Design a protein around this ligand. Structure first.
Ligand code: HEC
Ligand code: HEC
Ligand code: HEC
Ligand code: HEC
Ligand SMILES: [Ca+2]
Ligand SMILES: [Ca+2]
Lengths: 323, 323
């Protein structure tokens, strides 16, 4: 039917797995090292924060707090997005300031309000542990310096690239199952398309591919759009980039409240309404709103099964937790 | 041989699993619910602390920081012990104030320097998520009030009870593999028993069953025994309990540095020496110390394989992160 044709020209399902990146097999030695690294809180200076702290794999890959709490209980400027499906995004972070997951991982380690570490500290910590030395050596066989900050970032990337959420009701619908969307979700899917939401939220991720003003038509209030965060401007210094953000990828959006970069909006219904007004100049009917919320619930996929990694013991030369 | 017979008289292996508790079967449903609760940060006021935060399953079931960092980054008075094998200990906590895991679990929830929450906030939180309501109704089918604070604690205990670490090289040895300990370990074991470490550190957990002064003979250094933490004296208000702590169970001690209730001691060789002097009045020879450290490494068991739980989404009526 028509609705199916229309959706199929706009969206793509999440693949059942990702095993390739930039045209090469993901190394599984690298995938398994990256998994240890993602959960190792010793990548942080305090030894109390891992990537999983802010990107909890049990709660949609996000920490679901307005803005993340990092080193010294410092809350950041932004809501942490999910790491799930992040490989398919055209760039990383709310302002697209990282090309890929490899480059992205370097931010958190060094960010004083997140992990508050350095390249040297990381290298020294990982190199102090024989199991890590051996795992880096094997995962990076052509390297004269297998244990390094850049290779740590590559391993984490390899792991994250695998963290995808296939077979959401919407994907099963895309792939051929007409009844995977209930009648409400089909109305919501329709409302989403016809209102123009899909102009910014399209493809594999329903967003993450381009940057737009938060307020293409009308600026949200100052709590939803804090004046102190100019988004893309901070990257490009082009003035028309003030308050321009990456279109948020909508996969698993039901699982990652609160919403927008600012984490101020707890209800999905309110996020949908704010988006009609801000981006489309359209006050959505109560029905469109509820039906779009329903459709967004169809976006939540099979959560990846994470077996908690065993991390190797610290040794005598392992740096100690500090401030 | 004689060494083996001497060891069999004082020590017992960790069982392969635990399926019973207080003469009753552990319900799978309680166990599975307990795992969800153990990992759910929404049991903390801030939504950023779970049990796993301070009792990390990846790093021996302890945070491996001197004293735990909790709500608002407040450092506690004490080092967090492992939750592994904690079921076998006569009482819980360094001062034995909780009878068992169920009673223990309520402590961290309400501790201002840890989770900073309340039974009322927990119940509001669990009651607000339909998956949790259902799961309690099925886990606690004989309760007038399935979703309760008491039941939360009983669920956590049922999960924790199952986190055991069997088949450490010591336990393989006990069970009849005479080669599971190498020659240095054999010597360490011999020194351990003969010096009288085993008077306080015995049975299943090599400790955990009885309370002794830290400094039965000589008072340790005040770095290891800060004057503001008086152990059981706070529990009982009995003067003779000043600086009395539970004999530490030694299972996985190699994996859980730093050491003692205060977490000031990062090297097991230094922990062993302090124990010798303080408890036995003996300056152990560097060689005996090296050997006993090697024996202590034999107490590292097979770590539990934990599948990270999928935690159900917050709703409109789930309490928001605060302080
Ligand atoms: C350990 C090295 C990691 C890794 C691999 C990732 N994180 Fe974070 N994260 C946090 C916040 C607030 C953001 C958004 C900040 C901004 O946009 O300026 C992020 C962002 C990410 C991404 C981007 C994904 C996307 O869809 O844009 C990725 C892939 C990512 N992170 C991975 C918050 C935190 C923390 C708070 C204290 C910590 C710790 C981490 N992140 C750690 C890591
Ligand atoms: C571009 C002109 C857009 C159109 C039209 C719509 N959306 Fe959007 N969306 C866009 C951006 C640039 C952002 C990020 C804004 C920010 O700085 O936070 C978003 C975000 C959302 C969200 C929240 C996602 C999250 O926090 O993870 C939702 C729920 C959302 N958008 C939905 C939505 C709807 C329902 C729309 C049509 C009615 C719609 N968007 C249009 C870009 C654009
Ligand atoms: C830090 C912010 C913690 C939180 C979160 C949790 N625990 Fe904890 N735990 C912590 C400390 C500092 C201590 C020792 C405190 C003392 O006065 O003795 C503990 C103790 C336990 C124990 C005792 C085990 C033993 O060998 O004595 C257990 C079984 C335990 N904690 C379990 C537990 C649970 C189930 C938690 C989630 C509700 C939890 N802890 C959180 C530090 C912190
Ligand atoms: C009773 C009189 C004891 C004898 C004899 C020995 N130990 Fe002990 N041990 C005892 C107590 C009361 C405690 C806890 C002290 C505190 O307040 O922290 C301990 C603790 C240990 C530890 C620390 C384990 C950890 O922090 O996880 C170790 C490594 C240890 N004990 C080893 C040990 C050795 C090698 C002994 C023979 C020299 C020895 N203990 C004797 C009680 C008693
Ligand atoms: Ca969010
Ligand atoms: Ca310890």
């Amino acid at each position: 039917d028509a609705l199916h044709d229309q959706a199929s020209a706009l969206f793509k399902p999440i693949p059942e797995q990702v095993t390739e990146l930039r045209g090469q097999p993901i190394s599984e030695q690298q995938r398994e090292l990256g998994k240890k690294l993602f959960f190792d809180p010793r990548l942080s200076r305090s030894h109390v924060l891992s990537c999983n702290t802010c990107h909890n794999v049990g709660t949609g890959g996000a920490d679901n707090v307005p803005t993340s709490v990092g080193h010294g209980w410092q809350k950041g400027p932004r809501n942490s997005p999910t790491v799930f499906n992040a490989v398919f995004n055209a760039a990383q972070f709310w302002d697209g300031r990282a090309k890929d997951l490899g480059e992205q991982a370097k931010g958190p380690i060094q960010n004083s309000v997140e992990m508050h570490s350095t390249p040297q500290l990381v290298e020294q910590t990982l190199g102090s542990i024989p199991e890590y030395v051996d795992a880096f050596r094997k995962a990076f066989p052509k390297a004269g310096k297998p244990v390094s900050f850049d290779n740590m970032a590559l391993a984490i990337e390899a792991y994250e690239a695998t963290l995808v959420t296939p077979d959401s009701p919407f994907d099963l619908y895309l792939k051929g199952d007409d009844k995977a969307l209930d009648a409400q979700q089909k109305k919501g899917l329709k409302a989403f398309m016809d209102s123009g939401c899909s102009a910014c939220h399209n493809g594999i991720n329903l967003g993450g591919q381009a940057y737009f003003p938060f307020g293409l038509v009308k600026k949200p209030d100052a709590s939803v759009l804090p004046s102190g965060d100019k988004g893309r401007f901070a990257v490009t210094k082009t003035q028309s980039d003030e308050y321009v953000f990456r279109a948020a990828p909508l996969r698993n959006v039901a699982l990652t409240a609160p919403y927008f970069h600012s984490g101020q909006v707890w209800e999905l219904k309110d996020a949908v309404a704010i988006m009609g007004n801000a981006q489309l100049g359209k006050q959505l009917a109560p029905d469109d709103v509820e039906n779009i919320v329903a459709f967004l619930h169809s976006l939540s996929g099979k959560q990846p099964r994470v077996e908690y990694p065993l991390l190797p013991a610290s040794t005598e030369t392992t740096p100690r937790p500090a401030e």
